[PDB]
Amino acid sequence: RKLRETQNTLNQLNKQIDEMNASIAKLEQQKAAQERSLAAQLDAAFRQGEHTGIQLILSGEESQRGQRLQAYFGYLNQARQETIAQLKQTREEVAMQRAELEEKQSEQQTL
Amino acid sequence: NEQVRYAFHGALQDLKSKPFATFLTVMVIAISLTLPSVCYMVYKNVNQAATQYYPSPQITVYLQKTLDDDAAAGVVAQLQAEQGVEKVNYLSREDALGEFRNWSGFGGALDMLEENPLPAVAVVIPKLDFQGTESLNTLRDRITQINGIDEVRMDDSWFARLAALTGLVGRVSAMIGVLMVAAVFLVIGNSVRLSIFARRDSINVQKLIGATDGFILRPFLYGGALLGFSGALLSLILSEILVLRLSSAVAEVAQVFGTKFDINGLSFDECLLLLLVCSMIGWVAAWLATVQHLRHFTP
Amino acid sequence: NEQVRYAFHGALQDLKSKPFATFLTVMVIAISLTLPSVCYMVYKNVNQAATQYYPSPQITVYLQKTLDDDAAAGVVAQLQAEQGVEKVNYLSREDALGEFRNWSGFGGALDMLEENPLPAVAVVIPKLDFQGTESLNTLRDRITQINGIDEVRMDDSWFARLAALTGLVGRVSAMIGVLMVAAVFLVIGNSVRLSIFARRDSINVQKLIGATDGFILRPFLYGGALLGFSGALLSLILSEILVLRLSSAVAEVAQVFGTKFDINGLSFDECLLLLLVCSMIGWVAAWLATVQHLRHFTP
Amino acid sequence: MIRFEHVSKAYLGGRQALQGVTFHMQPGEMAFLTGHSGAGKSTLLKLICGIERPSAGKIWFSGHDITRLKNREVPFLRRQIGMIFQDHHLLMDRTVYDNVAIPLIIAGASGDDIRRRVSAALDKVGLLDKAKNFPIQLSGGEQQRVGIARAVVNKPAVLLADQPTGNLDDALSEGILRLFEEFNRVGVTVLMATHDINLISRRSYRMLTLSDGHLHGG
Amino acid sequence: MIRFEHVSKAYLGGRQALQGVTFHMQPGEMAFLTGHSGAGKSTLLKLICGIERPSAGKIWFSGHDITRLKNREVPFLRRQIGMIFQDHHLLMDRTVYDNVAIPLIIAGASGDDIRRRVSAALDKVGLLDKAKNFPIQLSGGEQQRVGIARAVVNKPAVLLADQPTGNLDDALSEGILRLFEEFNRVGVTVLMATHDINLISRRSYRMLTLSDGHLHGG
Ligand SMILES: Nc1ncnc2c1ncn2[C@@H]1O[C@H](COP(=O)(O)OP(=O)(O)OP(=O)(O)O)[C@@H](O)[C@H]1O
Ligand SMILES: Nc1ncnc2c1ncn2[C@@H]1O[C@H](COP(=O)(O)OP(=O)(O)OP(=O)(O)O)[C@@H](O)[C@H]1O
C-alpha cells in the first residue's frame, strides 16, 4: 500500500516534471526569446529606438504622426504595453505554476 | 490736334536734354520696383503654387481582431465608403507589417513575439458627407459606429504648427509689400516734383505771356508718365535676369529635398497692369507738382 | 574754424528754405531704408532660433555584446574620443539603464525580464571637418563600420535640410539685401544731385572772386550728410515702431506652436553703423554732384 | 483805352510804390513814362498788364474793369498786349525761333504762317541771322531784341515797353523807336518807360513823369 | 597793367567775336570802351577777367601772362579784379548785405570790419536803407547798384565795368561815374564799357572803339 502510494507520488512527480518542462518551454522561452522581444519593444525607446523623439516632422509626413499615434511607433508602444501586461501576467502565472509544481513535488517528496 | 504732338515733342526734348539726369532717375525707379515684382514670384511660385494638402485628420478607427479582407469592404460599406470618406487606406494585417518594419520602428520582434498585433484600422479621407467640421465631430463617432474597429485613432493634425505660418507669416510679408508699394510711389513722385522744380522758370515765363492753365500742364504730364512707364519697363527687363538666375539654385535643392518646385516668370496679364499703374503714378505726381507750382506765380 | 560754422549755417539755411521738398526727400530715404533693417532683423532672429534648436544630432553606432569598459576605452581611442568627436557620451551599461527607465519608454521590466541588455551608446559630436554630410557619407559608414559597435543609427538628414534652408535664406536674402542697399544708394545720390542741380545757379561764387573749389564745396557736403543722416534717423524710429506692431501677434503664435520666441531689435552698434554709413554715402554723393558742376562752369 | 482812377499800390512790407495815380490814354496814343530810379514805373506797367493787384482805386483796360479779375480770365487780358520786360524773360533752353513763335502757338496758328510771321518779326529787328541759336549764344542787346521781336509778333492792341532800348546803342535805339512809331501809326496804343533824355527830346509825345509814386505828369 | 598783344577769340560755332585786338593800359589809367551792339566788348572784358580763353595772341595782367593760366590759379587773378557784369550775377536767395559781403568772406576778414565796410559800400551807392531786403524786393536800378557795391567793396586793383549805368537815370549815372573817378584817383585802373554818349562826351578820357571785333581806337 505504501508502494502504491509511492507509485502514485512518482507518477505525480513525473507529471510535475512534465509540467516543469512545459513551464520551461512557455515561461523560460518567454524569458529568453520573447524577452529579447520585450526588451526590444522597450529598446524602441532604450536600444536603437526612439530616444524620446520630439523632433518636428517635415512636410508630407509618411506616417510619422500616425506612427506615434498607432503604427510602428505609437501602436508599437501600445502593443508593447499590452505585451508587457501579458508578460507580467505570464510572470505571475510562472510564479504560480512554480508554486504549484513545488507543492506537487513537495507532496511527492514528503510522501 | 497739333497741341498733343507739340507737347509730346517738348516733353521728349526736355527728357533728352539731360541724359545722365534722366538715366539716373529711371535707374532708381526700376530698382525700387523690382522688389515687389520679385517678391511676388515667391508668393505666386512655391507658396500657393506648390500647395501640397495639409495636416488633415485622415487618421481613423482602430479595428479589432475581427477585421479581415472581407471586413475591409464591410467597414467600407458602413463608414469607409458609405459615411464621409473619399479614399481607402486599409493597411490591415500584412499590409502594415513590412511597411512598419522599414519605418522608424525596427523589426525583428515579430519573429520573436509570436505575431505582431498591429491594432487594425484604415486611414480615410472624410468626403463632403463627413468632411464638414461638425459633419465629422459628432458624426465622427457615428463614423466609428460602422462595422467592428475596436478603437478609433482618428486625430486632428496641423495643431499650432498651422499657426506659426498663418499668423507670423501672414502679416510680416504683407507689411513688407505695403512698404515697397509705398516706396515706389514716393520715389516716382519725388523725382517728378524735382524735375518740375528745376524748370519752374519756364512755367513762370510762359504764364505771364498769356497762355492758359492747361497749355502749361501738358509737357509736364507727358514727361511724368513717360518717366514712370520707362522706369517700369526696365524693371520688367530686370526681374527676369534675377528670376532665371535664381532658377538654378531652386532646381538644385529640388532633388536634394524631394518634390521639384518649378519656378516661372511674370505674366503679360500682370506686366501690362504694372506698366499702367506706374504710368498713372507718374502722371498724377506731375499734375500735383505743376498745379502746386502754378498757383505760386499768380500775384 | 569760422568757415565750418558759416558753411554749416548755409547748409541749414538751404535745407530749411523749402520744407516740403526736404521732408519728402527724407521720407523717401527712410522708407527705402526701413526694408533692409526689417529683413536683417528677421534673418538674425531666425538664425538665432535655428542655432538654439539643434546644432548636431547624437546618433551613433549601436554597440553589440562585445562592448565593455575596455571595449569602450578602445572605442574612445578609435572613434569616440580620437576621431571626429567634440565631447564624450559613452552611456554604457547602467548609465543607459535609469535613463532608459525615465525616458518615454516605461521601465520596471528589469525586475521580471532578468537583466536589461542596455546598449553601449557612444555618442560623440564630430568636428567641423566631419560635420558635413558629404564628408560624413562614406566616412560615416566607415566610422560606424570601424570596430566595436555593430549596428549604426544613421541620421535622417535633418541637418542637411536645415543647411539647404539656410542656403536659401542665404542666397535669396543676400540678393534682396544687395538690391535694397543699391536702392538706398541711388535714392540718396539722386536726391542730392537734383538738389544741387536746382541750386546750381551759384556760378556767381565761382566767377566772382577766388572762391576756390574748397570754399564752394563745403556748403554742399555738409548739406548732403545732413540729408542722409536725417534719413537714417527717421528710419530707426520708423523701423522700431513697425516691429513693435508685428511683435505681440508674432510672439503669441510662437508660444502656441512651441516657445514664445519673440523678436529683438538693433544693438546700439548697429544703429551707429547705419547712421555713419548713411552720412558717408550722402557726403560722397554731394562731392560727386558738386564736382560735376565745378567743371562745366570753367573756361 | 487805359484809365487809372486813384490807383495806389503798396507791396508787402511797407514800401508804398504808387500813391494816387490817375490818368487816361485814348485808343491809338503814344506816351513816355519817365521818372527817377525806384519811382514806380515797372509797378505801373505791371498793374496795367495784370501781374500785380492794386491796393486801392480802379484800373480800366479796353473799357472793362480789371481791378478785380478772375484767374480764369487773366490769360485773355494778357493776350491783347505785347509786353517788353526788363529781365528779357526768355526761355533759355529753346531756340530764338521758338521763343518768338511761342505766342502764335499759344494763340493757335498754323505752321507755315508761324514760319512766315516769325521770320518777318525777326527781320524787323535784325536777328534773322541768329534764328537757330540758343539765347545763351547772344549778346545782351541781341537778347533784348529777341524780346522785342517776341512782343510785336502777334499784332497786339497795346504795347507796354519797360526800358526797351537799354543795352542798345543810339542808332539801334532810334531804329526800335521808329518800329514802335510805325506800329502806332496803325492804331496801337504805346506806353514806353524810358531812362533816355536824348531819345525823348527829339520827339513830341505826351510825357507822364512820376516822382516817388506820385504822377503829377498827366 | 593790362596788355593785349594780337588777341583773337572765335566762339565755338563759327562766330568771330574779336580779331586782332592789341593795346596797352598803364596802372591807374581810366578809359572807356565803346561800340555798336555785338561788337565784342563783353568778350574783351571776359578775356581780361579769365572767364574766356583767347584763341590766339597774348594777354598780360600785372606782368604775368594769363593766356595759358591754369585752373588752380584763376581764383587769385579773379580776386585782384572788381567786375560788374551786365546780368548783375547776384545770388537771389540772400540779403543784399550777404551779396555785398561775400567777397570779404572769401578774402578772410573779421566780423566788425565786414559790417563796417559793407555799410560804407552800401551807402556809397545809396542802398543802406535796404541792407536787409532780398534782391527780389528791389528794382532794376537798385539791383544794378547792389552789383556796383559788391564790386567796389574789396578795394581792387583793376575795375572792369560792363555798362554799369544802363537802368540808372542821369543823376545816378553821374553819381556812379564820380564814384569810379574817386576810386581811380587813388591808382585803380578803370575800364568802363558803355554806349551812352552824354556821359563820355562831358569827360575827356581815352576811348577804345570796337566795330565787329576790331579795335578802331587805341
Ligand atoms: N517785388 C517787390 N516787392 C517789394 N517792393 C518792390 C518790389 N519790386 C519793386 N519794389 C519797390 O517798389 C518801388 C518801385 O519799384 P519799381 O520796380 O516800380 O521801380 P522802377 O521804376 O522800375 O525802377 P528802375 O527805374 O530802377 O527800374 C521801389 O521802392 C522798389 O524797391
Ligand atoms: N557764348 C557765346 N557763344 C557764341 N557766340 C557768342 C557768345 N556770346 C557772345 N557771342 C557772340 O560774340 C559777338 C560779341 O558778343 P559780345 O557779348 O561780346 O558783344 P557786346 O559788344 O558785349 O554786345 P552788347 O553791346 O549788345 O552788350 C556777337 O556775335 C555775339 O552774338
Numbering used by the authors:
A (entry chain E): 80 to 190
B (entry chain C), C (entry chain D): 63 to 361
D (entry chain B), E (entry chain A): 1 to 218
Please share text taken word for word from the publication where this structure appeared:
FtsEX, an important component of the divisome, is mainly recognized for its involvement in activating the degradation of sPG through amidases via the periplasmic factor EnvC. FtsEX belongs to the Type VII ABC superfamily, which includes LolCDE and MacB. In contrast to the reported ABC transporters, FtsEX neither transports anything across the membrane nor extracts substances from the membrane but interacts with EnvC to form the sPG hydrolysis machinery to separate the daughter cells during cell division. The activation of AmiA and AmiB by EnvC is controlled by the cell division protein complex FtsEX, which induces conformational changes in EnvC through ATP hydrolysis.
Consequently, the structure of the complete FtsEE163QX-EnvC complex consists of 2 copies of FtsE, 2 copies of FtsX, and a single EnvC. Based on the cryo-EM map of FtsEX-EnvC, we built a model incorporating FtsE, FtsX, and EnvC coiled-coil domain. The core domains, including the transmembrane and nucleotide binding domains, are determined at 2.8 Å, while the periplasmic domains of FtsX are determined at 3.8 to 4.5 Å. Notably, the cryo-EM map of the restraining arm and LytM domain of EnvC are almost invisible. We observed that in the ATP-bound FtsEE163QX-EnvC complex structure, the 2 copies of FtsX appeared to be asymmetric. According to the superimposition of the 2 FtsX from the FtsEX-EnvC complex, the transmembrane helices of the 2 FtsX molecules are almost identical in conformation, but the periplasmic domain of one FtsX, compared to the other, shifts approximately 17.5 Å and rotates 37°. We speculate that the binding of EnvC results in a relatively rigid conformation of the FtsX periplasm domain, while the transmembrane domain of FtsX is almost identical. The 2 X-lobe structures of FtsX tightly bound to the CC domain, which couples the conformational changes between FtsX and EnvC. When our structure ecFtsEE163QX-EnvC(ATP) and the paFtsEX-EnvC(apo), paFtsEX-EnvC(ATP) structures are superimposed using one FtsE as a reference, we observe overall similarity between our ecFtsEE163QX-EnvC(ATP) and the paFtsEX-EnvC(apo) structures, with conformational differences are observed on the EnvC coiled-coil domain. Furthermore, it was found that FtsEE163QX-EnvC (ATP) had a similar effect to FtsEX-EnvC (AMP-PNP). These findings suggest that FtsX-EnvC, like EnvC, only moderately activates AmiB, while ATP-bound FtsEE163QX-EnvC strongly enhances AmiB activity.
